[PDB]
Amino acid sequence: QRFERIAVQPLTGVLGAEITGVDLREPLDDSTWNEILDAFHTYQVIYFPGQAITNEQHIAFSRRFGPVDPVPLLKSIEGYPEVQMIRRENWHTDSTFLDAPPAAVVMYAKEIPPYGGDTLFTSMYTAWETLSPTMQATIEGLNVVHSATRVFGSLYQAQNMDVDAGDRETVHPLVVTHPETGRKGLYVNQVYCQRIEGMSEKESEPLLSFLFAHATKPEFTCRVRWQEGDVLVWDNLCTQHYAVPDYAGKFRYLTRTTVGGVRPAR
């Protein structure tokens, strides 16, 4: 459908859009914001090239999507605790080991190399919608146990307060309904998902592995090639991403805010 206040160029037939004709330094009238949000909900990952915003403006824009909150586990900028920094992998979405993972993240590209460092995204809506009705009926009711044990718990510690938070488990549905759109998507990721609730690891592995692979098929993905000035927003519920490491040695600087969400619900 038509967008009168913004220009929306989809990136692929499945997800992602470039949005122009907006200056994120200016606060946004109701009808313009509504179109941004409409675009966010359809395309799931959106970016706005050529922006030149400050830390306060970044914050302010992020706040139109939901509460923003300093995330500990990241560095965070001098004088602006809400803005985390990224500088110098596996498919995942952010922090699903929490009861209430982030709803979204807004990332600002400050310094980029001429090439390298692309970020991939998939649509977990499309992931779910491409399973057969029988497969959907089969896993619809399952919950999954998430935990950070491989990232900074005891499994990571194996290798060759900090640990107990890494080992702490939470439970989320295998399929979640988006709190704004009402659309079902697959909610599973390879970094944090440990097993299916009430099953053993050996029972869970076949199914989870299938789901990990299925959800990252190239046809469900888009690729964002970063440019200085890109402000990018991803839905943390209905996408996964993969920040490509390839640049090796080239300096890359982005800032990032995290917008909060509610418990994932079926």
Place this chain on the structure above:
Amino acid sequence: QRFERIAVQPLTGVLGAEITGVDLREPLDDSTWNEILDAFHTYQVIYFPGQAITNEQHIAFSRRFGPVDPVPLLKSIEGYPEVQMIRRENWHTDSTFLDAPPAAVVMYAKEIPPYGGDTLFTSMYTAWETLSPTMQATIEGLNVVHSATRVFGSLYQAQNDVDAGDRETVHPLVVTHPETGRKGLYVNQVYCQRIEGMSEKESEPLLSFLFAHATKPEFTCRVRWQEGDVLVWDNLCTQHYAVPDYAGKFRYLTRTTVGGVRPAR
């Protein structure tokens, strides 16, 4: 669980029993047969050593378990069409590509080498019972598509009749035994192609898990054949694996097939 008419020695803690104190040349009184059948239903694969029976007696004994019928795609003995031969692998149970696979089979060892040629069996009841309640609730409702396409259909043809080999049937993933009422897993690697309504790629993880789980050594027994062993297996609640190892040694067994009904949930 005392047996007054027969001697029942379980082979393992999970399945299989040797049964002695019976002569299968003699027809069997009601109370003795009932004990045999009681033992068949608990132990799932049973054998009777030291028998010396004829083709008619074999047939007759088989008929106490259910109808017996010549199986086409057979060798079959001269003058006795119901008795198939076995002479000179993967875990499976017999002919699940049929709408109505056999209920059981009774095998008679006529000539054996001194060692080699053991046959393994697993309990699909125990296979099912060892899955978690969540895994059971998850697959309970699924059906599986069976077909002979890898054995004598078009897929077999690719490795360098066909339409009967490719013909598909559908069975539940979990079946209730028609006599005992016990649920067992009903899946095998030779005939099961995919889960009904799913794609191959969707089915593969789950089926593979189920194939491996059902053949764990702890659910198995091993029968070491002796000339004169008469053996009966339930074709619904077990799978077996005839070990090829003898290479070159002559082995001769006869076999009857007892019919069954459509597998039901």
Place this chain on the structure above:
Amino acid sequence: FERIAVQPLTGVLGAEITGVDLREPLDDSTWNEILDAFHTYQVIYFPGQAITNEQHIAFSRRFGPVDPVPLLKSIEGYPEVQMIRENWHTDSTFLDAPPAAVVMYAKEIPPYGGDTLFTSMYTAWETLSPTMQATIEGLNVVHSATRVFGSLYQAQNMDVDAGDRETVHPLVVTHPETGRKGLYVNQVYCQRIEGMSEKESEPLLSFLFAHATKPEFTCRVRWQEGDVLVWDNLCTQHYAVPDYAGKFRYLTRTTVGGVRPAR
């Protein structure tokens, strides 16, 4: 690069090349830079071109012989130019002598959808440990078209005997121009490792398929009308994304020859 502008697409492979009009024939020093860029970046494209079938052919001929591929559609009056109207693979590895390269011309595109991915099989190989490299170095692989148009494809319900015909290629190939070792394996045509069984081959091949298509070794080309694109058929694989269903897409294509893949 004095005669052309080369913008790499990623840190690993792919370049946009501008400042050239492919209607004009190319002096020696300019061609040499194109070819230098082709060999480093492995898949290159030139936006904004407006060329005819003869010019396309001519440009393709600078990379090597071009020859009608009789297995494919082919344009009216121009037998060398095939028309185009999924899994990771490279082209036709079931031949003893697969193409060295392909030059593809985008004539009609939808506004979005239909991207094509590429990976570097050089980088795929270079990221295996020295022990894993020493282990598979010596292996050959059996390729055949049996899953695409042989008897296996036929299952599922001469064309067939050519589909079933097997050839053998090394698992690691040295590029005949660059001298660089790359991995040479693909999921569509590779059937088993030579002298092994399928069951023996499966673990190893599967690992290699997955490893070679890691996002970090890939680039993604988003087609535009007028793009002329050249890929090395030896040291890359590609994946034409289906995501457009019903949108009309028209590209032409020439196929350039090369030598039998060699260790």
Place this chain on the structure above:
Amino acid sequence: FERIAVQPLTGVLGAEITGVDLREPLDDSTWNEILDAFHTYQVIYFPGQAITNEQHIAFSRRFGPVDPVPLLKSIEGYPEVQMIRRENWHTDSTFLDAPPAAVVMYAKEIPPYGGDTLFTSMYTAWETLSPTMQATIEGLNVVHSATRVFGSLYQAQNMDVDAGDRETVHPLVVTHPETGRKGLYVNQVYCQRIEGMSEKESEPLLSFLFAHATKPEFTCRVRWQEGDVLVWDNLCTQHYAVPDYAGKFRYLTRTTVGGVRPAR
């Protein structure tokens, strides 16, 4: 075989040996036949024995040195005799540089059924790989460690630990120090990765090898009886003690015989 009776269990491995009383010491020609049988059949057992701890030890010593294994229970007054009382395919303690060459196990108390032990022939496992697959893995070494059994990985499923984490390296294919026969040397409990490869690289290959080596056709199954004395080669077999008895009392004793570091 003039001095003993040898009944093979399967066409591939295992033999029952009768016509010997292990309380009596053994003349040269008889022992030689036992040892000949051990080397061909790889796991051998002698039913109906009634031996003491000293006799057990003595018999074990004919196969090689026997030595107390610390980190197992060990009997009162007889440090060489470990006890087994109340799973995955493996062979014993391959995390050592020098794992045992063999083990001699004595069944003292058994339930009437349950508790069978499986064995496979790693010779046959190796011999059934294609020549190309053999040439491909011939040169590889494997890293072994006890980290999943009693090291840090085991610890994660909530000194002991540093010995559990200690790694050693063994060939993937070993030549038996007495028979000269090549067998596969890989097991799922202790083998962690292939030397110089990553875990992700190693997994396909190791997994294939685990499965291949335990095919029923390479296996035998020993159904224990009170009085069985059983000897397995720890280099050229793996075993799997079936748990199927829960609560039935099972008592066996065990001695461990030394050998040489596994070599190509």
